[PDB]
Amino acid sequence: LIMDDLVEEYVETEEENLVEIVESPSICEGFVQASSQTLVIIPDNERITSNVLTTFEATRLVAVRAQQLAINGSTMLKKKYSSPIDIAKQELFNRKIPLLVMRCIKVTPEGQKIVEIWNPREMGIPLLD
Amino acid sequence: LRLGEMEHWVLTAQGAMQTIIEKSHDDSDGCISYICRNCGEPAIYNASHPIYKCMNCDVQADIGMVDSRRSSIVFQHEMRAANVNITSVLSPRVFQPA
Amino acid sequence: CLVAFSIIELRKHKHDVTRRFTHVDVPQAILGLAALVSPYANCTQPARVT
Amino acid sequence: MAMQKLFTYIYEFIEYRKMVLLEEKVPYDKFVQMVLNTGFFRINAETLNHGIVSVFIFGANGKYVHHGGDMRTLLTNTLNEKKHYEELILIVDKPVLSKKNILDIIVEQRAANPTIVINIYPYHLFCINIPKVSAIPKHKLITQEEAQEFLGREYLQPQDLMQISASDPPVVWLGGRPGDFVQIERPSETAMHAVVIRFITKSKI
Amino acid sequence: RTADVGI
Amino acid sequence: NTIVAYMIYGGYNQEDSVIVSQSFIDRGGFAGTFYREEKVELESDIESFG
Amino acid sequence: MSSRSGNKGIAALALPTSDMPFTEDGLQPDLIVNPHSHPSRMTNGQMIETTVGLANALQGVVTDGTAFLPINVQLLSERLAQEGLRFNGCQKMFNGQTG
Amino acid sequence: MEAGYAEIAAVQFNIAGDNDHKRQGVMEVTISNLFEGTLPAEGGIYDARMGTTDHHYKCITCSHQRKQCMGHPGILQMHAPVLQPLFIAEIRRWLRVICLNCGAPIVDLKRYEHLIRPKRLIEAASSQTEGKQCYVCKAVHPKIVKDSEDYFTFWADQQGKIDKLYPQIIREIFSRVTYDTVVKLGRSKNSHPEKLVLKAIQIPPISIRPGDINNVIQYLVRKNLLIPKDLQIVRGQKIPLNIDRNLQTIQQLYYNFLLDSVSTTATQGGTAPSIMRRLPRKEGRIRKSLLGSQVWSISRSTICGNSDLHLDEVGYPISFARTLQVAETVQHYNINRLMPYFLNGKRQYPGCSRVYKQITQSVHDIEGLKQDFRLEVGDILYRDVVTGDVAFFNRQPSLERSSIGVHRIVVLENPKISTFQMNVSACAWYNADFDGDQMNLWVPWSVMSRVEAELLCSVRNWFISTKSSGPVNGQVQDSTVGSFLLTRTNTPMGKNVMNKLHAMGLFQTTQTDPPCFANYSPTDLLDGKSVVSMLLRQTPINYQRAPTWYSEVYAPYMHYNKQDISTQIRNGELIEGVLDKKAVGAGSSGGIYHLISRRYGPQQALKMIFATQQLALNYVRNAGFTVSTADMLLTPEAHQEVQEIINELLLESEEINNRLLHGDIMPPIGLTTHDFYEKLQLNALKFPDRILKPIMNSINPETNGLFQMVATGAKGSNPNMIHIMAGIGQIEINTQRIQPQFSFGRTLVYYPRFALEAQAYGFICNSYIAGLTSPEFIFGEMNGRFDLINKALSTSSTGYANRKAIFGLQSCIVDYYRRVSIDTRLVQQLYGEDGLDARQLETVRFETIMLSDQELEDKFKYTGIQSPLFEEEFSRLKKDRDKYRQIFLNVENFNFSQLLTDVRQVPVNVASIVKNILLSSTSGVLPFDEKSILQKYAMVKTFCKNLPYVFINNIQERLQTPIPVYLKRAASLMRMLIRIELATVKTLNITCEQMSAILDLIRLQYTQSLINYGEAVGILAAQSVSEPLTQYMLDSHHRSVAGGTNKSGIVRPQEIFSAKPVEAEQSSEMLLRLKNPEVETNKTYAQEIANSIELITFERLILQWHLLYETYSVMYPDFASDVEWMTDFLENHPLLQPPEDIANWCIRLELNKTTMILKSISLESIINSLRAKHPNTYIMHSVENTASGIPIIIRIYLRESAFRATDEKIAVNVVDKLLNSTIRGIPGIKNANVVKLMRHRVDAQGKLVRLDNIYAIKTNGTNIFGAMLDDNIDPYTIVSSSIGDTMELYGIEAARQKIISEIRTVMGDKGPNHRHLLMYADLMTRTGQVTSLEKAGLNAREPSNVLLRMALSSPVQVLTDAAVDSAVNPIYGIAAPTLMGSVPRIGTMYSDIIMDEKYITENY
Ligand SMILES: [Mg+2]
Ligand SMILES: [Zn+2]
Ligand SMILES: [Zn+2]
Ligand SMILES: [Zn+2]
Incomplete structure (x- = not known):
């Protein structure tokens, strides 16, 4: 008759305090898809973000390049390195990386994805070697 | 062996990712979720057996491939079991002006 | 009860009419069996005795 | 000593608002006599925009803050005169801000005259020179053009900014209205002062 | 053994 | 009753570490037997040992 | 590993007999304990026990060290001198690896 | 086909009606059978169309296996409707606001057409509406009664007519509600009440109910099969007995399936874990499966020390290295390197275990690939972990940014080693020790994770603390003592020198290239400073600081060597002084390793730490170091001296006791005699400074190991040595002595009642080495148990606070403008107000701050060229100094003890750059050149003008586009530092090209110090502020606990x-400055004011009071003698005759004469503070001449003007009002002491002088308004510890500054960087109100972030409110993406990567 495995009833006590008209059209109810965006690339002379790669951006570039060299491997590097990580790091250091950095500055309500496109081959590299 | 809340906080304080990804998805229950993108409901996609369908809007199925975890899928299923409708809006497609 | 913590304390106040103990204690009686394993525990920080 | 500090500091509040005084200035004793007898003191000031600002200094034990009908009658009568009346300021005691009925007539009068600004403030808001307080950094209202250019450079909306209440004592002394922008020069222990722009929102009450 | 639960 | 030298020896006993004599370990110092049990039951008559 | 004064210890290194430090009279330790574990912890009972057991071993006796028993560290240190050892329990030791 | 890649941008929560269930259901449950043999029964709850959980069958719906099938919902068509268990409260609200006959709203919709939408329905249902008449159908609205026997049954009460509101009837009622009524009541069109009743429930996918929760579903299906399918219940049908019970049990089964064992505030009613029970708490779905996760490819073991490993290395046992594998993809560049791993296979290390062949798209065992010879391109080889691989090292609890670090693997090939070995200097990253600690180690196998581990998470990035902005690692214990022993001038053996052989042996294990000893003879002697310089010449730095070895408290004793008390390093050469904790210790800001990291990078710093540790350990390998029992033994003479000192302490205590016995102890105003006596005893029993004299007389400092560990900072402190050798002293618990808890007046059974000796109250007269007696040991055990309790509950309290802070701050992320924003709403205009990383700061003195007007001219006014440019430069310098002084003197004014400092944390140490360039300069004392000097001045001026462009880019600097004002202010400090250190007087021997190089180096260092885009700075601040909280707990027994x-x-x-209000604060304080600068010096005046503003009420001075029904112009018999002094008062007060409105009610109060004497309260003060306070009263007092024995009686007679409710009750309320009147002081101030204030003021010479002779009142309790009303306090300098008081009176900005100051006070001296406090304060004040870090603050700040609020706490209510309100949850931050199975878009994912199509086409 003795049951040991009790479940410990759980209680929430602090209540939240968040602060014509027809049935529904095919517009107000629905349209979860969200309208497509157009890519508004800021002109190179209007860019305000840093011309130096952050350690996050440089690390992501190296990781993406090395993962791509894992499946690919056609490389523009001169010296031969035995690991994709070293190859990607030297590609970034030799300014031969085939990737670009897009910094999404703002998404407008009208449907514009305002971005700044930065070339890592003309950027400052903060990584170590 | 568990990578708890605080380990994730430390990893995201270092801004890591790609290790949160590796451990929490590739070395954990990480899976692939399919959403219709037209209604936001979990869609049915199968490449081998040809299945591209949505139990919601049928001819309007536009299935997107979303990286997820089985824990999150189970959590959303549990929310829907309590009669709470979960709809994923999905990121809009962005197009470069030609 | 007013207890002298040791026979040394009782002997010290043998003629002290202002300290009239009802009982005398053996000092080791305040520790359990596991605490008494520690040698010279009163010379060690008590948290280390724990 | 609330009434003395109120008397000495309300006029510098008016001057800090860049308002020219109207009527005259009365001694302290006559001031408290009027406050006890009539139940309140009224101070009239004129803004640079040729508008009129009326300050009502009610008493803690006055009848106008104990019965809602008296306050309703006073507000209706004062708003029925022929003046621009840019803003009405009613200075009351702190518990008066808790008596819901008076706040209800204040809201009703505010709805009755939308073009007229009615604000009710506690005593401590005018019992010290707020801009001269050491703990309070320098607040300054920036024009809508400067705010618009700042938001355009930052790719920001006014709703993305940090918020500040229109009942904030520095904002009250500045005269900022909801929807405006205030530039704050705050002292900094990392950069040796800093500049922040906040969005003025609806005043508490 | 999910089938251990019968009919 | 281990012989203990309270000293610095190569920085290998820092922060609650201890350098142990390998010979002391080999001779039986703190050596012993660890026992684990494995109890398994036949679920019903449809199971048997073999 | 731990002493009776609450000083836990993780075995980090095992050294052969030749690598262990040894005294001029050939005494070597089973364990080497960092002296820095003593000051903050104030486990002086362990030091006193070492001092008393040094004389106990040479005298062939098993002394009682129960808490609150009458104790005099100076008298025990003098007792160390009567066994041929120094006033402290300190001895001339040689590095086992270099001699 | 080809499902394209997508990401979830937002999540919509809605109430799922039966239409949604029908649309989403893949199958309809119709039978109760579970399995048809080995397969699920079709139409049952286990039917495979719902998904597969077993390997024995596929899905059918998606034709996937168990792993790839996410599960699909089904349908159960209920024969009778059921109410939605989560929205019972919504059903109740809707039932009370709409007519149950025609569905029209009984309430007036215009009445609530001014509230916000989430509140309209709540207020509509709040109104009674019972008996209201519908204006459409003229029906009477009944009383909606919620049954108290269950959580779902509703009762319709029509003036006693009782009828059950069945779900079918409720659906009929709710289906008559128009969408117009739904919208006008603040509800979404997706929240129509018709969805609150379900005729078709959704049976969840089998993926969430694996093969109990299916028992409830089976029971529900079985009970649903019993109800007739044609059941049609209308209002008042009288379902006889059994359909009623069946419907009730079906509704109860559904309610227990959804919400069993979970209450929630929205639960109306009373009386197999459910679906909603799986979510909350630590073991629930969210916290255990979404916010954290169990992972593969990970190891755990005990950690032990290994001094032969570098700081960035970890010792990995080989058995673990053959278990964890690295995934290397075979390509042309790595095939040759990976071939040995393939050949070794599983038989030899290093080998491999699995191969993923690309041609077969599957994994192959290494023992089945014996015929492959080589590996193909595109193959994936899973090789063993080898030395040099990177691994993630983690110790729980993970509280710091360095709690997870990346180390290079060193594989330990000894099969008998099973521990994770690490350098002892690496333990500071993890707060680890080698006493049983276990750490997790996992080796990244994927390429991206490995890149990130070696590029982002390496422990070299955590050498500088993100919290304290200082070094983390350094020499510890044996290394600190070894550095001291190696660098000391003399040993007991003479001069500290070694021959060439032993000098060479010091570098044997340094792992560096050894220095050259060829210029040394075998008999040559080398001092330790020489070998330390040989090591440190590789990274030349400049150091000049007194060592920890030299302590002034030790100076009177000992004989300090003059060459050991001034540590100086010039260009890597140790000239003099010893190296100890101050120079080489871990966490030593400004130490040699911090300088090495600043000039050469933290990797060089870690390498130098390892090298110097090896040097010190190799020195101790010959010098030897030990501690003995004799090290802690006093000499008999020193023991007698210690006994004499303790006798003097006890004699002072006995003198205080004798004063108490004779009644000579008079407490001051504000303390009782007990409190004053306790304070006197606590002051009397403190050990004097001369207690060290006997200790050092017994200690040979050049030989004492214990003293050497304590003095060099390796371990221990002076109190430890004093407790060990001389005596423990007074045991203090919460600032007070031992309380008498054994009995009334007894502390222990060993001491008498009301004992006055100090020993009875915790004073321990014996040292640890002498041994403690039984009562002394009991008091010590009480103290130690306090320490243990505080340590135990510190973890839990820190966990609670840390989790709350993390969830409040995690969404704060640095954006591309280097602002901090929650999604898009700003929190900071610039991170830390300077846009700098906390790891890239250096403390630098500003030389011009303290200079007067004349020394500023004599040091910085250049007079070598008669040009106005140098006058302008000096004016700029003076204006910078004046602005700094004004800002940081204003900061002094709104703080308690925040003094103006000469040093600031700056990204760039300009003076160090100039010194390095001058040292490397191949010139010196350049000839005078006006053109060069003016050119250098112009370059510096232009560089200062263009400095804020480091915050934007080189493009805008070239275009000279306008700089925002906040970015101009961000560079103010660096502009100041540059203009000081690059002044013309300081740059006379620097060429123009050298000036260009200096400016370029400054620009590079400033750019390298900026905070990265996408940093989770909120989480950084949460960690940096929660870490000191456990130490704040560890000193909880050293802090006051009294009210x-x-x-x-x-x-x-x-x-x-929690942003607790003023009334909820238990330690409120205020600081008041006298409104007279010239009389703040008088301590007596300050004490007068402090005692004047102390709050004294009438109740404080009442012994007892009696209210009476007697008028006056009968008398309670017990006080018939009062008429004597009553008539005396009438005679002595001719103009105070009783008025002709005297009523029956009157109080008679007895004044407490003891309190009146102690508080200096006079009867006239009471009479005038009650007479000119109370209008409707008549007060009478006795003749104050009363001595001891006859009392002062105050009879207050009331008037009917007060009575102008029960008369007796209002009379008692009047009594209460009279008692609470303020006799003296300012309301809210319990105590008011006088404190000595340290302040800076600028004198007439322009000099900044620190004044110690300022007196101020430090009150207990806060009243800013009251403190500003009195004219004896400066109103513009009121500092109160209350955040709410400051916000209410000063504003949100002052509230933010107060939050900063209070958090800084809590953190203490070892607090985090100021930018983390700025983060905390700016998050809490971003809305214009002081929001908390609790659930309410999150609700105020991020109401739309439903997932984050569910992850924090109370998931059920948050989910219910989101469903009801149709909340749209944008996916941002960390918690929301994580709960959706995605990754936060921060850090490496903050910026996305695209392919450079043009470059790829033109460079294939
Ligand atoms: Mg530990
Ligand atoms: Zn769809
Ligand atoms: Zn399936
Ligand atoms: Zn009706």
Whole structure:
């Protein structure tokens, strides 16, 4: 008759305090898809973000390049390195990386994805070697 | 062996990712979720057996491939079991002006 | 009860009419069996005795 | 000593608002006599925009803050005169801000005259020179053009900014209205002062 | 053994 | 009753570490037997040992 | 590993007999304990026990060290001198690896 | 086909009606059978169309296996409707606002057409509406009664007519509600009440109910099969007995399936874990499966020390290295390197275990690939972990940014080693020790994770603390003592020198290239400074600081060597002084390793730490170091001296006792005699400074190991040595002595009642080495148990506060403008107000701050060229100094003890750059050149003008586009530092090209110090502020616990973080400055004012009071003698005759003469503070001449003007009002002491002088308004610890500054960087109100972030409110993406990567 495995009833006590008209059209109810965006690339002379790669951006570039060299491997590097990580790091250091950095500055309500496109081959590299 | 809340906080304080990804998805229950993108409901996609369908809007199925975890899928299923409708809006497609 | 913590304390106040103990204690009686394993525990920080 | 500090500091509040005084200035004793007898003191000031600002200094034990009908009658009568009346300021005691009925007539009068600004403030808001307080950094209202250019450079909306209440004592002394922008020069222990722009929102009450 | 639960 | 030298020896006993004599370990110092049990039951008559 | 004064210890290194430090009279330790574990912890009972057991071993006796028993560290240190050892329990030791 | 890649941008929560269930259901449950043999029965709850959980069958719906099938919902068509269990409260609200006959709203919709939408329905249902008449159908609305026997049954009460509201009837009622009514009541069109009743429930996918929760579903299906399918219930049908029970049990089964064992505030009613029970708490779905996760490819073991490993290395046992594998993809560049791993296979190390062949798209065992010879391109080889691989090292609890670090693997090939070995200097990253600690180690196998581990998470990035902005690692214990022993001038053996052989042996294990000893003879002697310089010449730095070895408290004793007390390093050469904790210790800001990291990078710093540690350990390998029992033994003479000192302490205590016995102890105003006596005893029993004299007389400092560890900072402190050798002293618990808890007046059974000796109250007269007696040991055990309790509950309290802070701050992320924003709403205009990383700061003195007007001219006014440019430069310098002084003197004014400092944390140390360039300069004392000097001045001026462009880019600097004002202010400090250190007087021997190089180096260092885009700075601040909280707990027994000053535990931090109101604060304080600068010097005047503003009420001075029904112009018999002094008062007060409105009610109060004497309260003060206070009263007092024995009686007679409710009750309320009147002081101030204030003021010479002779009142309790009303206090300098008081009177900005100051006070001296406090304060004040770090603050700040609020706490209510309100949850931050199975878009994912199509086409 003795049951040991009790479940410990759980209680929430602090209540939240968040602060014509027809049935529904095919517009107000629905349209979860969200309208497509157009890519508004800021002109190179209007860019305000840093011309130096952050350690996050440089690390992501190296990781993406090395993962791509894992499946690919056609490389523009001169010296031969035995690991994709070293190859990607030297590609970034030799300014031969085939990737670009897009910094999404703002998404407008009208449907514009305002971005700044930065070339890592003309950027400052903060990584170590 | 568990990578708890605080380990994730430390990893995201270092801004890591790609290790949160590796451990929490590739070395954990990480899976692939399919959403219709037209209604936001979990869609049915199968490449081998040809299945591209949505139990919601049928001819309007536009299935997107979303990286997820089985824990999150189970959590959303549990929310829907309590009669709470979960709809994923999905990121809009962005197009470069030609 | 007013207890002298040791026979040394009782002997010290043998003629002290202002300290009239009802009982005398053996000092080791305040520790359990596991605490008494520690040698010279009163010379060690008590948290280390724990 | 609330009434003395109120008397000495309300006029510098008016001057800090860049308002020219109207009527005259009365001694302290006559001031408290009027406050006890009539139940309140009224101070009239004129803004640079040729508008009129009326300050009502009610008493803690006055009848106008104990019965809602008296306050309703006073507000209706004062708003029925022929003046621009840019803003009405009613200075009351702190518990008066808790008596819901008076706040209800204040809201009703505010709805009755939308073009007229009615604000009710506690005593401590005018019992010290707020801009001269050491703990309070320098607040300054920036024009809508400067705010618009700042938001355009930052790719920001006014709703993305940090918020500040229109009942904030520095904002009250500045005269900022909801929807405006205030530039704050705050002292900094990392950069040796800093500049922040906040969005003025609806005043508490 | 999910089938251990019968009919 | 281990012989203990309270000293610095190569920085290998820092922060609650201890350098142990390998010979002391080999001779039986703190050596012993660890026992684990494995109890398994036949679920019903449809199971048997073999 | 731990002493009776609450000083836990993780075995980090095992050294052969030749690598262990040894005294001029050939005494070597089973364990080497960092002296820095003593000051903050104030486990002086362990030091006193070492001092008393040094004389106990040479005298062939098993002394009682129960808490609150009458104790005099100076008298025990003098007792160390009567066994041929120094006033402290300190001895001339040689590095086992270099001699 | 080809499902394209997508990401979830937002999540919509809605109430799922039966139409949604029908649309989404893949199958309809119709039978109760579970399995048809080995397969699920079709139409049952286990039917495979719902998904597969077993390997024995596929899905059918998606034709996937168990792993790839996410599960699909089904349908159960209920024969009778059921109410939605989560929205019972919504059903109740809707039932009370709409007519149950025609569905029209009984309430007036215009009445609620001014409230916000989420509140309209709540207020509509709040109104009674019972008996209201519908204006459409003229029906009477019944009383909607919620049955108290269950959580779902509703009763219709029509004036006693009782009828059950069945779900079918409720659906009929709800289906008549128009969408117009739904919208006008603040509800979404997706929240129509018709969805609250379900005729078709959704049976969840089998993926969430694996093969109990299916028992409930089976029971529900079985019971649903019993109800007739044609059941049609209308209002008042009288379902006889059994359909009623069946419907009730079906509804109860559904309610238990959804919400069993979970209450929630929205639960109306009373009386197999459910679906909603799986979510909450630590073991629930969210916290255990979404926010954290179990992972593969990970190892755990005990950690032990290994001094032969580098700081960035970890010792990995080989058995673990053959278990964890690295995934290397075979390509042309790595095939040759990976071939040995393939050949070794599983038989030899290093080998491999699995191969993923690309041609077969599957994994192959290495023992089945014996015929492959080589590996193909595109193959994936899973090789063993080898030395040099990177691994993630983690120790729980993970509280710091360095709690997870990346180390290079060193594989330990000894099969008998099973521990994770690490350098002892690496333990500071993890707060680890080698006493049983276990750490997790996992080796990244994927390429991206490995890149990130070696590029982002390496421990070299955590050498500088993100919290304290200082070094983390350094020499510890044996290394600190070894550095001291190696660098000391003399040993007991003479001069500290070694021959060439032993000097060479010091570098044997340094792992560096050894120095050259060829210029040394075998008999040559080398001092330790020489070998330390040989090591440190590789990274030349400049150091000049007194060592920890030299302590002034030790100076009177000992004989300090003059060459050991001034540590100086010039260009890597150790000239003099010893190296100890101050120079080489871990966490030593400004130490040699911090300088090495600043000039050469933290990797060089770690390498130098390892090298110097090896040097010190190799020195100790010959010098030897030990501690003995004799090290802690006093000489008999020193023991007698210690006994004499303790006798003097006890004699002072006995003198205080004798004063108490004769009644000579007079407490001051504000303390009782007990409190004053306790304070006197606590002051008398403190050990004097000369207690060290006997200790050092017994200690040979050049030989004492214990003293050497304590003095060099390796371990221990002076109190430890004093307790060990001389005596423990007074045992203090919460600032007070041992309380008499054994009995009334007894502390222990060993001491008599009301004992006055100090020993009875915790004073321990014996040292540890002498041994403690039984009562002394009991008091010591009480203290130690306090320490243990505080340590135990510190973890839990820190966990609670840390989780709350993390969830409040995690969404704060640095954006591309280097602002901090929650999604898009700004929190900071610039991170830390300077846009700098906390790891890239250096403390630098500003030389011009303290200079007067004349020394500023004599040091910085260049007079070598008669040009106005140098006058302008000096004016700029002076204006910078004046602005700095004004800002940081204003900061002094709104703080308690925040003094103006000469040093600031700056990204760039300009003076160090100039010194390095001058040292490397191949010139010196350049000839005078006007053109060069003017050119250098112009370059510096232009560089200062263009400095804020480091915050934007080189493009805008070239275009010279306008700089925002906040970015101009961000560079103010660096502009100041540059203009000081690059002044013309300081740059006379620097060429123009050298000036260009200096400016370029400054620009590079400034750019390298900026905070990265996408940094989770909120989480950084949360960690940096929660870490000191456990140390704040560890000193909880050193903090007061009494009322009005309760600072024990987390009371103050919870008050700060929860934004608790003024009345909820237990340690409120205020600081008041006299409104007269010239009389702040008088301590007597300050004490007068402090005692004047102390709050005294009438109740404080009442012994007892009696209210009477007697008028006056009968008398309670017990006081018939009062008419004597009554008539005396009438005679002595001719103009105070009783008025002709005297009523029956009157109080008679007895004044407490003891309190009146102690508080200096006079009867006239009472009479005038009650007479000119109370209008409707008549007060009478006795003749104050009363001595001891006859009392002062105050009879207050009331008037009917007060009575102008029960008469007796209002009379008692009047009594209460009279008692609470303020006799003296300012309301809210319990105590008011006088404190000596340290302040800076600028004198007439322009000099900044620190004044110690300022007196101020430090009150207990806060009243800013009251403190500003009195004219004896400066109103513009009121500082109160209350955040709410400051916000209410000063504003949100002053409230933010107060939050900063209070958090800084809580953190203490070892607090985090100021930018983390700025983060905390700016998050809490971003809305214009002081929001908390609790659930309410999150609700105020991020109401739309439903997932984050569910992850924090109370998931059920948050989910219910989101479904009801149709909340749209944008996916941003960390918690929301994580709960959706995605990754936060921060850090490496903050910026996305695209392919450079043009470059790829033109460079294939
Ligand atoms: Mg530990
Ligand atoms: Zn769809
Ligand atoms: Zn399936
Ligand atoms: Zn009706």
